[PDB]
Design a protein around this ligand. Structure first.
Ligand SMILES: O=c1ccn([C@@H]2O[C@H](COP(=O)(O)OP(=O)(O)OP(=O)(O)O)[C@@H](O)[C@H]2O)c(=O)[nH]1
Ligand SMILES: [Mn+2]
Ligand SMILES: [Mn+2]
Ligand SMILES: [Zn+2]
Ligand SMILES: [Zn+2]
Ligand SMILES: [Zn+2]
Lengths: 773, 188, 133, 146, 114, 263, 84, 36, 164, 65
């Protein structure tokens, strides 16, 4: 039982962590002293007889050394105490307990480990000074920072055990996690703040620095890119150099509010063939976002390339930031004198509204809503007036801050800070509260002995008019400390309660595994799900894709999918296809084209039943839009020529592909049907994306490009299928627990208390509600 | 025993925000001001927004002024001292009112495109240091692998590792068993 | 060795939009009224104002690394003042009966709207931009 | 016509006062009494400080060289904070400080001070910045009822 | 304890040379010299000079990790022009430039009254 | 004499306010760094404590001793202890000093740096003399003694550089500025209402021509003309810090040509 | 309880797990001086070699995938399509 | 009872001596054994 | 509430509808009231949905509840993880809790983790009941000195005799 | 304990001006600011060095053992 609690910890060290921008994402800085204590039993073979010999000579005191040499018979020779330490002849088959060295797979863990991503394998990088070092972007999954935190490093002891870490646990193989079918690692702090400044149009760089920046990227091919400016001075763009970091064959389109192909605001994102075309690079693109740069590279180029991308981007930006500089100070929290007069009036305006409701209530003219107290309606209105006031006063402060304002800058890049922050620092702090109400009359009919009895005003019950810049009044101070205290306490509870839930979730789902028949079962062999996640797919291979068929007017649906060769106005113009003019009035093809349409129209029905809401964006395997954009890039498709695709090509081809996307292979009737159900949704997506008109009119694919797209979808589909052996149970529990730990905060029980009320199956709920339409 | 500040030691201001030394740089490499002044510490700007610790930015401004003027800086709560009031005095000393200053990069001598909030600030050295928590338990012939560490490896699917990390040193004794009765009653 | 576009433009609006070095110009066209142009320009290295006249040529020549001197004294194939170079992500809008293309100069965007450029504008990266006076 | 810089306050609607606060800053205890401009901080961060302060190095007493206690940390060159409090006077802080007024820069530099970490001037560390003494005393005896 | 000695910042350890020259593969006429026991003082200096030479196609320097005292210098030059020569031309140009400054200073220092 | 250009504004035994001109920022900055960290100097680097009844610990006093500026005029005529062919230290590579002080009077006895006594043979070279600049000839106050307290030490000075430890640094601070008028636009000024009105104008703005309204950005103007000001710590004459700095950098650059040679 | 080489419903593809254990077992044998089946073009690290053997399909191993009911299918490494 | 902290507890503790103010603080501490 | 519905032309359009939220629950009876839509009635009490609408309905509510608790903080979790939990809680035709319901196990084995200071008592009951340990857990396999049939151990590796 | 020998930030010798600072206060009755400035201490880093020191040795000296 002692070994069931980690009492006998052998071959592992622990220390303080530190961030290091000059280490690769999968590496871990292991201080020489610690690497001299941990060992790995390596066998003597002609592949290492030499190196092993050198180590043993270096002994236990010099780093690349060893501590013991075990002989065939099993005899141990202590290299520190042995009249022959420097006189040994290694024999094939002998063992040498050498110190850990560069690139050895080691398990790294930050407790509490409620996330498989809290234990990832890292390559060893032995360095000087004490303290374990990490790349800034591995910080989020481990949920650590560098103000005292300590993590554990574990050294695998066998050859099989070494492979298991690097082939399953390796940091790169975790970037895109199944918890949320999206990356869990991305660019943070400085690099994030610095990357946005770098990408701004006004950001240009001179030759002297571009060369250094280029050279900082180790995967650079020595080809100095041509300046975006050649005129009176060869000037480059931030975007230009950043692209050296992004590998070829990457595409990323993202349209924001008014983003156009000429995004004036330098909005959205557009990276073609590994070169940014337009848009400032920030959290939306480089963050752990769903369909961002990181998600793409991982899938498009693989985990190793993606891992290298973290380090490349960080070197160019950190370097660029180290010579540009960024700071923050009191100044950044000061709003315009006129803005302050607009803010103070906004607040005074709210205090007038509250004053009118009070008079109204004191006169008894105010009426309470159904099932609500007179006093409840009153409070409800005053708090709304006051929060409304804080909020609007906050916007005034934000609008005023310039694009130079550092606080505003960190918010635009997505690296620390938010609205509520600016609003409280610069303008009004807001209404304090404890247990969802304004500060209560703790003394008789008053909040403090400094007020008069029965004072229901905003200053009386906790409204903090002042900002942090201005400083709180002693009353605002105490009120805010009462609000604050509630947070410290709730956090302790939220921390104590969630930790227990996380362990109950694991314990209950711990033995559930995906078997070779795609079935999900528990240790007894009971079927929990006839196919995992009712689709037999691996969550880390699922991406949010829009199901077009479902939305829009019927006209728009028909204008996009309907093809009528028997109609001069609804056939495929001869310019979209060679056989264009001879397709007209082709009875036989039209029959084929009506089959495709009826099937799409069926889907529209089907989808509108499954998603009654009408929601079109749903996570699925095999990102079709990307495969298509890639095809176009790969085959340099020109929208100025008619394709060479036959109609039978598209229809029959799209039809044939659906027969190969396999989840289940059983030859019996039951399975073949279970196989049709599990691929129904993806198939509805497929048909809407490879509808003949879409292929010829929108994508302009050629017979070659098209053919390529099909085999790709197949290879990716099969690749997105769940692997038998997946401990899907434990995964599920941790996926519900880890984020449930991040629940620190209308009148319905939610948060942890609700979850604990759900998982307990309590007969007496706190807020038994009933919604009746 | 004398303890010189190293990498990993704790430090913090009187505003509820600690931090360990990530690294040390010599004066040459440190960014510098026109007057040749160099920083003893460098804290990150991203540690400002979320905490909303305005007091820290104000302590700095007040401290800069106090040191230049020779007067003690009143940072007492609930008084009429103001940032604006503190800015004027700082300005009267030749510096930009909001505590900002121009700085040059130590590697090139070239300027920084941004001005840095620069000023003195009180900092506390905390106990519990690196060399007092460095544990490496790897006998030859926190820091634990508990139930949660096990669940993790389980999700990774690393059964070999799980078996290796939990197999007691006890001898893998060899026994014989009957196929009819799962007992070790076989006389070998 | 080539040239793909040539014309003179009437600057009608120069917007700096919250920037401090680049402005987005939109000049009309001489001769043909169809032709239009929206382009970002590094004002610091070539100021621009309203009602000005800019001679704009696209060209595509006079991908190997890059060299600064010598060639910038000999084969000076630049009889202009402003010289950019970008990649075309050309979205031939085929708007009604006109044809509008797109160029990207390190983030600095450009867009022409005409129709007599069918056998002019490439469909590939390499595309310079020259302007004078 | 009030200074647009001062904090806003509510006008006095009473002529019934029976008492008056000697000084509002006295609602604090010894720890918070050491935080500069606490009325400008988010409430919870003041709490963190009142805790961390107890983990600082200073000069707990002036007779440390004579006491033989378990552990002790004496800051080499204690400094009195440039930004004090009126309460500090009675707390004897300026007499027995726990910190130094370091020149602090708020900047992204080499990026080696991210995620609540900090870069410290090595040259400063050489001239004694933040150096401290650390004493540890052991105790032992002899026989018992044997 | 884990911290390396201070002298290692400027003193070459055993088995170390001041210069390591290797042929760059990413490009022709390119070299990557590893300067041991030197920092930004020399790296940015020789770098800035190598840039004044027009027959130099490429010049950049970088210290891969602040823990260690060494930097990499990559140089690319026109055919026929040896990169090891540009480093010589740069070094000499510096030594001369500095020598002149030492003279001009010891001169202006004399014309002073204090 | 063509090339770099010195143009001294002020000069004294402590500071050298000058104006480097016609040079690359890199060189200017490189020299700035060399003066700060690589100019040889002598400084206590070993202390033998015989008697210490003072209120201070050994390492505490030791630490301070090493910080005491020592005469380093002929520092070049003193071999590095690590090079010297002797065993440990000798007059060829080190200066030995002693400190003996007793609390005799009733009033606190101050132990200054003047009380240091050289016990090794200086061989006629200006070196090892504790630097003094206070109008009292006392120098740096090392420690203080109460009647009865004693302190008998033995310091061994050694040649060293700041890179190894700041104590060995001859420089104090080094003002450095260029382009007082942001004409090059190397920096983007932060402001609220007015960039110019809010940012204090520099001393050097007078020594230069204010930009002219109409003139468009001069995109070719580089960074030359740097307004410096060195300040000596005393172990070496102000002018020397500069000169020797220029020389040291010159040596490094040379040590490389020699490397190419034997390469 | 054995299943004919025909009628196998299980995936033709190797699972990340199968591959991980195969690369681990095989590397254990290589580290123990066991003979190698692929031309060692420089590689010395056992795992690095094991991987080369997997690609060139020269690992004489067989995976016995058991079904929840007791039965099992036999797939040869050579046979298994590797794409993870 | 004064050495343990047992009364009928942790009523008595070793005086803090980390920093002067930390000692002051301890001497003015309060504890509540075991609605809001 | 605004309701996303298909407009007569096909495209989804918002159509407001009056809805009633109640404090207290009596599904079986409110559902029967005239003028309402029994087809869309609902309650955050999945237990009542189960006893009145059946287990399957219960599963869906149990899901919607868990989902909201997480979507509440703007967080997202792939459907499959919450679906798995909801299924485990529903397999036996009832609503089984996850928070340590059984004073013995959850789905472990006797030879598994030595829970409780007395594993002996658990052994007695196992003997008197003829308990059969499948040996699929980690702990149970640890004691047996074997790797668990999980992930990498969910299959066996054997030498091949076909490769020429 | 006692006047640090050099200023932490720049190294400017400052540990030889404590007594002077004191006299400039008592005997010359000058204010702190005006005093530090007459001691050649212009940059706030050096100024703080003396202005913030706490000469605890005086109280230490007051012990007999
Ligand atoms: O990535 C991060 C890290 C930290 N934080 C936020 O930091 C705040 C607390 O900031 P602290 O500085 O007190 O936390 P810490 O992480 O150093 O604490 P310990 O090591 O002592 O446990 C908390 O409100 C937390 O959510 C984030 O929001 N995101
Ligand atoms: Mn932390
Ligand atoms: Mn933190
Ligand atoms: Zn039997
Ligand atoms: Zn000697
Ligand atoms: Zn100073």
């Amino acid at each position: 039982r002692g070994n069931l609690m980690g009492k006998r910890v052998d071959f592992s060290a622990r220390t303080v962590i530190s961030g290091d921008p000059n280490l690769e994402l999968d590496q871990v800085g292991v201080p020489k002293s610690i690497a001299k204590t941990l060992t790995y039993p390596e066998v003597v073979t002609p592949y290492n007889i030499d190196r092993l010999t050198q180590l043993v000579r270096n002994g236990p005191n010099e780093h690349p050394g060893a501590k013991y040499v075990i002989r065939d018979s099993g005899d141990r020779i202590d290299l520190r105490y042995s009249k022959r330490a420097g006189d040994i002849q290694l024999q094939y088959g002998w063992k040498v307990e050498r110190h850990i060295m560069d690139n050895d797979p080691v398990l790294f863990n930050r407790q509490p480990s409620l996330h498989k991503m809290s234990m990832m394998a890292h390559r060893v990088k032995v360095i000087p000074y004490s303290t374990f070092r990490l790349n800034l972007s591995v910080t989020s999954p481990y949920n650590a920072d560098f103000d005292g935190d300590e993590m554990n490093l574990h050294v695998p002891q066998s050859e099989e055990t070494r492979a298991e870490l690097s082939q399953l646990c390796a940091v790169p193989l975790q970037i895109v996690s199944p918890q949320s079918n999206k990356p869990c690692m991305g660019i943070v702090q400085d690099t994030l703040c610095g990357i946005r400044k770098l990408t701004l149009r006004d950001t240009f760089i001179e030759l002297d620095q571009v060369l250094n920046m280029l050279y900082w990227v180790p995967d650079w091919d020595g080809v100095i890119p041509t300046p975006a400016i050649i005129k009176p001075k060869p000037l480059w763009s931030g975007k230009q150099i950043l692209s050296v970091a992004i590998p070829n064959g990457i595409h990323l389109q993202r349209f924001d509010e008014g983003t156009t192909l000429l995004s004036p605001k330098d909005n959205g994102m557009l990276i073609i063939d590994g070169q940014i075309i337009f848009g400032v690079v920030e959290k939306k693109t480089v963050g752990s976002s769903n369909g961002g740069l990181i998600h793409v590279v991982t899938r498009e180029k693989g985990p190793q390339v993606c891992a290298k991308l973290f380090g490349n981007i960080q070197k160019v930006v950190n370097f660029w930031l180290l010579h540009n500089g960024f700071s923050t100070g009191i100044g950044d929290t000061i709003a315009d004198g006129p803005t302050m007069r607009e803010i103070t009036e906004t607040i005074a305006e709210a205090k007038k509204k509250v004053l009118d409701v009070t008079k109204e209530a004191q006169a008894n003219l105010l009426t309470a809503k159904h099932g609500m107290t007179l006093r409840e309606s009153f409070e409800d209105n005053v708090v709304r007036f006051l929060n409304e006031a804080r909020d609007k006063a906050g916007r005034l402060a934000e609008v005023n801050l310039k694009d130079l304002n550092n606080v505003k800058q960190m918010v635009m890049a997505g690296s620390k800070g938010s609205f509520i922050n600016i609003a409280q620092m610069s303008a009004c702090v807001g209404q304090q509260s404890v247990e969802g109400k304004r500060i209560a009359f703790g003394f008789v009919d008053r909040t403090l002995p400094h007020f008069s009895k029965d004072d229901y005003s905003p200053e009386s019950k906790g409204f903090v008019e002042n900002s942090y810049l201005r400083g709180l009044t002693p009353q605002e101070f105490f009120f805010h400390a009462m609000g604050g205290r509630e947070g410290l306490i709730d956090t302790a509870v939220k921390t104590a309660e969630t930790g227990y839930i996380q362990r109950r979730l694991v314990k209950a789902l711990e033995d559930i595994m995906v078997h070779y028949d795609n079935t999900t079962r528990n240790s007894l062999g009971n079927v929990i799900q006839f196919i995992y996640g009712e689709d037999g797919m691996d969550a880390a291979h699922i991406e949010k894709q829009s199901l077009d068929t479902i939305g829009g007017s019927d006209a728009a649906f028909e204008k996009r999918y309907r093809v009528d060769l028997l109609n001069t106005d609804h056939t495929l113009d001869p310019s979209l296809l060679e056989s264009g003019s001879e397709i007209l009035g082709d009875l036989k093809l039209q029959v084929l084209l009506d089959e495709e349409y009826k099937q799409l129209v069926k889907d529209r029905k089907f989808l509108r039943e499954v998603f009654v809401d009408g929601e079109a964006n749903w996570p699925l395997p095999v990102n079709i839009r990307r495969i298509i954009q890639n095809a176009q890039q790969t085959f340099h498709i020109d929208h100025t020529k008619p394709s060479d695709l036959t109609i039978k090509d598209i229809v029959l081809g799209v039809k044939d592909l659906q027969e190969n996307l396999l989840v289940l292979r059983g030859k019996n009737e039951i399975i073949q049907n279970a196989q049709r159900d599990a691929v129904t949704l993806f198939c509805c997506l497929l048909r809407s994306r490879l509808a003949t008109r879409r292929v010829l009119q929108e994508y302009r694919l050629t017979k070659q490009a098209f053919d390529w797209v099909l085999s790709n979808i197949e290879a990716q589909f099969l690749r997105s299928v769940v692997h038998p052996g997946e401990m899907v149970g434990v995964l599920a529990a941790q996926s519900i627990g880890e984020p449930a730990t991040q629940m620190t905060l209308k009148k319905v029980t939610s948060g942890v208390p609700r979850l604990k009320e759900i998982l307990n199956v309590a007969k007496n709920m706190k807020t038994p509600s009933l919604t009746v339409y | 025993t004398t303890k010189i500040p190293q990498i990993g030691d704790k430090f913090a201001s009187r505003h509820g925000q600690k931090g360990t030394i990530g690294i040390t740089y010599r004066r040459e490499d440190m960014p510098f001001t026109a007057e040749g002044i160099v920083p003893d510490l460098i804290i990150n700007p991203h540690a400002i927004p979320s905490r909303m610790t305005v007091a820290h930015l104000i302590e700095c401004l007040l401290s800069k002024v106090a040191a230049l003027s020779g007067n003690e800086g009143d940072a007492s709560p609930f008084t009429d001292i103001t940032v604006e009031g503190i800015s004027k005095l700082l300005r009267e000393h030749g510096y930009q009112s909001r505590g900002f200053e121009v700085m040059y990069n130590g590697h090139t001598g070239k300027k920084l495109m941004a001005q840095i909030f620069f000023g003195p600030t009180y900092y506390q050295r905390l106990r519990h240091m690196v060399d007092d928590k460095i544990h490496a338990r790897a006998r030859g012939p926190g820091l634990r692998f508990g139930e949660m560490e096990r669940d993790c490896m389980i999700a990774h699917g690393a059964a070999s590792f799980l078996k290796e990390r939990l197999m007691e040193a006890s001898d893998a004794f060899r026994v014989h068993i009957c196929g009819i009765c799962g007992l070790m009653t076989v006389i070998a | 060795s080539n040239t793909l576009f040539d014309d003179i433009f009437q600057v009608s609006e120069v917007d700096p939009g919250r920037y401090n070095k680049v402005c987005r110009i939109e000049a009309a066209s001489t001769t043909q009224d169809q032709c239009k142009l929206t382009l970002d320009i590094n004002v610091e290295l070539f100021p621009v104002a309203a009602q000005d006249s800019l001679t704009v040529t696209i060209a595509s020549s006079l991908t190997r690394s890059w060299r600064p001197p010598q060639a910038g004294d000999r084969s000076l194939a630049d009889d202009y003042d402003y010289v950019m170079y970008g990649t075309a992500y050309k979205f031939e809008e085929v708007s009604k009966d006109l044809i509008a293309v797109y160029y990207s100069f390190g983030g600095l965007l450009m867009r022409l709207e005409g129709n007599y450029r069918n056998l002019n504008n490439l469909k590939q990266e390499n595309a310079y931009l020259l302007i004078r006076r | 016509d009030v200074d647009p810089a001062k904090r806003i306050r509510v006008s006095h609607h009473a002529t019934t006062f029976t008492h008056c606060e000697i000084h509002p800053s006295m609602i604090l205890g010894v720890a918070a009494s050491i935080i500069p401009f606490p009325d400008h901080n988010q409430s919870p961060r003041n709490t963190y400080q009142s805790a961390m302060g107890k983990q600082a190095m200073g000069v707990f007493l002036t007779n440390y060289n004579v006491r033989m206690d378990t552990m002790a940390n004496i800051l080499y060159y204690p400094q009195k904070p440039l930004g004090t409090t009126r309460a500090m006077e009675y707390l004897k802080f300026r007499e027995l400080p726990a910190g130094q007024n370091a020149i602090v820069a708020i900047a992204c530099y080499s990026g080696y001070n991210q995620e609540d970490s900090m870069i410290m001037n090595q040259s400063s560390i050489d001239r004694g910045l933040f150096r401290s003494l650390f004493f540890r005393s052991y105790m032992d005896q002899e026989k018992k009822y044997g | 304890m884990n911290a390396p000695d201070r002298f290692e910042l400027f003193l070459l350890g055993e088995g170390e040379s001041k210069l390591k020259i290797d042929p760059d593969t990413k490009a022709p006429n390119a070299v990557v010299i590893t300067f041991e026991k030197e920092d930004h003082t020399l790296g940015n200096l020789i770098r800035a000079e190598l840039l004044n030479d027009r027959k130099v196609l490429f010049a950049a320097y970088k210290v891969e990790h602040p823990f260690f005292a060494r930097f990499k210098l990559r140089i690319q030059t026109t055919e026929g022009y040896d990169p090891k020569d540009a480093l010589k031309n740069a070094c000499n140009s510096i030594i001369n430039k500095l020598g002149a400054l030492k003279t001009n200073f010891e001169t202006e220092w004399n014309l002073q009254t204090l | 004499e063509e090339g770099p250009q010195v143009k001294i504004r002020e000069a004294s035994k402590d500071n050298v306010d000058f104006i480097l001109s016609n040079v690359d920022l890199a060189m200017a900055n490189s020299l700035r760094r060399v003066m700060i960290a690589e100019i040889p100097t002598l400084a206590i680097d070993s202390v033998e404590v015989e008697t210490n009844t003072t209120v201070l610990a050994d390492e505490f006093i030791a630490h301070r001793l090493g910080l005491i500026p020592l005469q380093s005029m002929d520092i070049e005529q003193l071999e590095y202890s690590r090079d010297c062919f002797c065993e440990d230290h000798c007059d060829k590579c080190s200066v030995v000093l002693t400190l003996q002080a007793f609390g005799e009077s009733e009033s606190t006895t101050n132990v200054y740096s003047k009380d240091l006594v050289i016990v090794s043979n200086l061989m006629g070279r200006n070196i090892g003399h504790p630097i003094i600049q206070d109008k009292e000839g006392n120098g740096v106050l090392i420690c203080k003694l109460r009647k009865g307290q004693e302190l008998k030490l033995t310091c061994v000075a050694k040649k060293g550089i700041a890179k190894e430890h700041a104590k060995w640094g001859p420089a104090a601070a080094i003002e450095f500025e260029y382009d007082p008028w942001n004409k090059l636009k190397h920096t983007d000024y932060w402001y609220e209402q007015d960039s110019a009105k809010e940012w204090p104008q520099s001393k050097n703005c007078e020594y230069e021509d204010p930009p002219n309204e109409g003139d468009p950005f001069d995109y070719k103007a580089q960074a030359d003309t740097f307004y410096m000001n060195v300040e000596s710590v005393g172990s070496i004459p102000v002018d020397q810090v500069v000169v020797r700095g220029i020389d040291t950098l010159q040596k490094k650059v040379a040590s490389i040509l020699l490397a190419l040679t034997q390469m | 309880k054995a299943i004919p080489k025909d009628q196998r419903a299980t995936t033709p593809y190797m699972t990340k797990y199968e591959r991980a254990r195969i690369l681990g077992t095989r590397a254990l044998q290589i580290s123990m001086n066991a003979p190698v089946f692929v031309d060692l073009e420089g590689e010395t690290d056992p795992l690095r070699i094991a991987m080369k053997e997997l690609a060139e399909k020269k690992i004489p191993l067989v995976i016995r995938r058991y079904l929840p009911d007791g039965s099992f299918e036999d797939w040869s490494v050579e046979e298994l399509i590797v794409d993870l | 009872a004064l050495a343990t902290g047992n009364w009928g507890a942790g009523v008595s503790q070793v005086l803090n001596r980390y920093t002067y103010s930390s000692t002051l603080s301890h001497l003015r501490r309060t504890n509540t054994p075991i609605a809001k | 509430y605004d309701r996303k519905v298909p407009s007569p032309t096909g495209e989804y359009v918002k159509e407001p509808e009056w809805v009633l939220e109640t404090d207290g629950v009596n599904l079986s009876e409110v559902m029967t009231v005239p003028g309402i839509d029994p087809t869309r009635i609902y309650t955050n009490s999945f237990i009542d949905i189960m006893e009145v609408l059946g287990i399957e309905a219960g599963r869906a509510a149990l899901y919607k509840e868990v989902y909201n608790v997480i979507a509440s903080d703007g967080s997202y979790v792939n459907y499959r993880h919450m679906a798995l939990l909801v299924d485990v809680m529903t397999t036996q035709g009832g609503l089984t809790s996850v928070t340590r319901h059984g004073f013995n196990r959850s789905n472990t084995g006797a030879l598994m983790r030595c829970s409780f200071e007395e594993t002996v008592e658990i052994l007695f009951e196992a003997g008197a009941s003829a308990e059969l340990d499948d040996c699929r857990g980690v702990s149970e396999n640890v004691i047996l000195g074997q790797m668990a049939p999980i992930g990498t151990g969910a299959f066996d590796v054997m030498i091949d005799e076909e490769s020429l | 304990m006692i006047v640090p020998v050099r200023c932490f930030s720049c190294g400017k010798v400052v540990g030889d001006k404590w007594e002077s600072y004191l006299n400039l206060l008592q005997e010359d009755e000058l204010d702190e600011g005006t005093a530090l400035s007459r001691l050649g201490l212009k940059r706030y880093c050096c100024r703080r060095m003396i202005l913030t020191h706490v000469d605890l040795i005086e109280k230490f000296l007051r012990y007999n053992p």
